[model samples]
Target: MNKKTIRDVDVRGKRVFCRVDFNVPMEQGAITDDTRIRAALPTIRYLIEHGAKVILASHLGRPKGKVVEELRLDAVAKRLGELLERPVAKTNEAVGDEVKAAVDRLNEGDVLLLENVRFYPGEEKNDPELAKAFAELADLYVNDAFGAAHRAHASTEGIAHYLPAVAGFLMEKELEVLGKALSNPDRPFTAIIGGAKVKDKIGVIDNLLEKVDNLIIGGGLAYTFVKALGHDVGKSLLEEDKIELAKSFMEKAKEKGVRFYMPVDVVVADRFANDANTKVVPIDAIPADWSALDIGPKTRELYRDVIRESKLVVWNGPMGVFEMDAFAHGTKAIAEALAEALDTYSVIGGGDSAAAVEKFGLADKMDHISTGGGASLEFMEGKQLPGVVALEDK
Candidate 1:
């Protein structure tokens, strides 16, 4: 986490290749959200102000190494220009003679955006030749794409092999905040885990058991744990094979003296949609034909109480199908509780949890909202990020 950053290097009169995450949501050839682009502005602005020729590179969508016309980054370039209030030149390709010429044309304080890196087959493969071609466009490499840092792609990790690789402001901040929460947080540290599958977060739960004082489990994953306790989970999303593993996780929590909490009651629906027939029921009394979609009122209150008393809190995933308004109450309640926990060092781990905070309009209330969903999950699992490991040390 203590990697070298842009400030640690001399960028004056240099061509700096900045790897950013501009994989924003697009609809009908328009950028739907610019938060990812805005997140990298501090680093881009700093480099430009310091007389660096910024050559920006990013992936738009999963083009799968083929040139997909709809996944082009032209909209992103326009949005970036509007945000920076300056002109940004773009190339037809990510790396080539034409792109290299564009890089050569950049003066100090100039910014250039490359086409979607995924347009090239070698970008995702981390091909040495592609990395070399990218390196030739700049004197140094700065990774600001924390959202894509977990992937060892050409622009993210391979480019580091050919240039002095350092972290950008966004990446530096992500590492700093998440690192502190995991390594040296103010006690008592509490981690709330939810979401659909136990398989997706088994590593995170295992890792957090060693560090947290309390672990709260909710959402669809809770059914697996409840079933491990011999309770009837009905038609809820249950990992039938993961029941044994869930039992072991609870046992490990007990051995480590970590307080473990799960839903005592839940909201059940006859069908999997918002308009389905729903009812509040105890966790052990769910009907055979109904599925639990959200935590019930009692569990929400209990979780709220636990979160309010915590000194540090980190939450990933939602308590229910928050995308549907009918089942969003539990997630909304958690968001409101976190918002009111002003003394707690709160962090919303990315993905559904981040989306929940934003959906409830309480994102600003959290101390840190992670930009990278998969990256944050991997961080919490105590794994080293390839992009981060490739950076120069301080």
Candidate 2:
């Protein structure tokens, strides 16, 4: 990762400022989902154990440049303190005298979480003065906030211009692990790309062709690909303009020696509803009145075989309209297959893939299920993340 990591630094007795993605979903002062905060514990623990006074900063929900009491980081701090088995103090301000006072009071192994970074417009604007003020609080800067890495905000990117920017342990490991998969993956490295649109997956498709040994397309976007191949997609979700692009991508895969697989069979429903009568049909025989809801058993078995043969598997998106139990079978089937994979580095990208893993209670079985939806997609697209890029190097 051409960046300095926490492991390379000596943080003893230093006030280490860290940008963390604590943008977790909350309701009435109680954190509904602490996944993002929990994802950052490794770096936080490392600093605390090494005698570093960690000054943590993060943005909760979209405060939209206003002081929102409900968006406070107190519950998160409390939860973190409970998890870390240490007292974690929360400050009501960011980059001001109050936050400074809290940090100044911190001794070795102590932690102080600053107020939300989005309380002011400057945080999102990447204001130089705001960045400078935030940087002034710590002796070293460590960014472990991959969830917000895609955005060039004050906490993630602007402040890096003022500090000796470096990666935290979490960020470092994320890059090291995901980088290996993208650069030199095991042979037969198959990427199962699903999701709603070809537009969102354009970069992933472009990037995977250069690295993956096989590319499997499913979900709504697969309809477009199937249509480009002259299949009658019926009322299935298809982005009309992307048909030619999908066809070209298939050709590119052929040229690049990447085995590409589309659905051989699909579950078609007469109407898109919970009670719609559904039937399994070959991809070529989907009726004119029906829309594809899920992958037929044949196609499911095909993908299962691909999973069995692959040494590494990276999957994003669901195989069908997975929110409904009737249509959830395809996604559930794949999740089960991935759960059964004993030794593969089963990486599930964010968004529906993450949801699918969580829904089936297979999150722990996977090698790494990313927490950031947009951030993961951007990283997989091979873009430099501003949040991580702005940290101090060791």
Candidate 3:
């Protein structure tokens, strides 16, 4: 990484304000998932071990600058304390005299977690006052929230202007892994792009055309490509306006000599539910009343062949509506293949793809699994993350 990290600076006895992505999935007052929280532990523990007073800041569910009790970080604070085996003091407000006073009481090696930053309107706007308030509570800044790196918020970006800013361990690792995948991937690199809409991945497809040897398209988005090729997609989710754009991508892929593959057959369903009667059909023969929800057996085997031959593989999104047991095979099979391909460098880009890996118990087999869904997507699109750019250069 060209950016300086926490290790490069002397954080000993400093009040370190660290921004982390603690936006984990919570259900009815309990944290349902702690993956994001666990990801931040390395950096938090590093700061504490170095005798730094670590002040952690993060946002939960969107509260739109209003005080939403349900969106508070109280549960997160409790969970963090349990994880770290240290008491984590929390303030009801993200910024104010009350929060400042709580921060002032911290001694070296102490940890404090601020309330949800989104509770302030200024936080999202990158307001100078809010940034200054956050800066006043610390001696230096360390950002480990790669999940929110694409946003230029007060805590994520603006705070950099007021303090000596650096990357935390999580940020450093994210850059290292994703950077290698994009700039210096092994030969026979393959990318599997799936999801619900073609518009969502237009930039990614455009960017990967210049790098990947093979580009595999699946999921609801593939219907648009099939329709662009003069095939009927039935009642599947279709971005009608993007058919022309899909055609252009295929043409460009051919011009770039990149092998492009889409599903030849799909699992069709009459309704969007687990109980819906399903059948396999050729891409051209999708019934007018049925929607294609997953790739068929033939296509799954075809994709497996390509994945097995690849030396480096990067996957984003899912091949089907994998939450339903009936429509999960295509995604599960892909995860299985990646897990078994012990010699291949495999990366599961964030979002549903990461969820699928976790669901199928294949997360440990991959070389890297991104913490940020939108951030990774933007990274794959070749866009520089504002939060990453705000750090001090090495």
Error of 3 at 261 (Å): 0.7
lDDT minimum window of 10 residues, candidate 3: 342-351
Off by over 4 Å in 1: none
Q: After best superposition, candidate 3 residue 270: deviation in angstroms?
A: 2.8
Collision pairs in model 3: none
Model 3, clash count?
0
TM-score of each: 0.98, 0.96, 0.96
Tell me which residue pairs clash in candidate 2. 164-392, 165-391, 165-392, 165-393, 166-391, 166-392
Between candidates 1 and 2, name the one with more favorable TM-score: 1
Worst 10 residues of 2 by lDDT: 385-394
**Candidates ranked, most accurate by lDDT first:** 1, 3, 2
Residue 172 displacement in candidate 3 (angstroms): 1.2
Per-residue alpha-carbon lDDT of candidate 3 for residues 1-394, written as tens digits (9 for 90 to 100): 6789988998999989999999988889999989889989989998999999899999998999989989999999999999999999988987789988888899989999999999999999999999999999989999999988899999999999999999999899889888888999998999999988988999999999999999999989899999999988889999999988998999999999999999989999999999999999988999999999999999999998999999999899899999999999999989888888867889888678887888888888888998878999999999999998899989
Tens digits of per-residue lDDT, candidate 1, 65-181, equal 989999988899999999999999998898878988888899999999999999889999999999999998889999999988898999999999999999999899899999898
- Please identify model 3 stretches exceeding 4 Å from their true place: none
lDDT of 3: 0.91
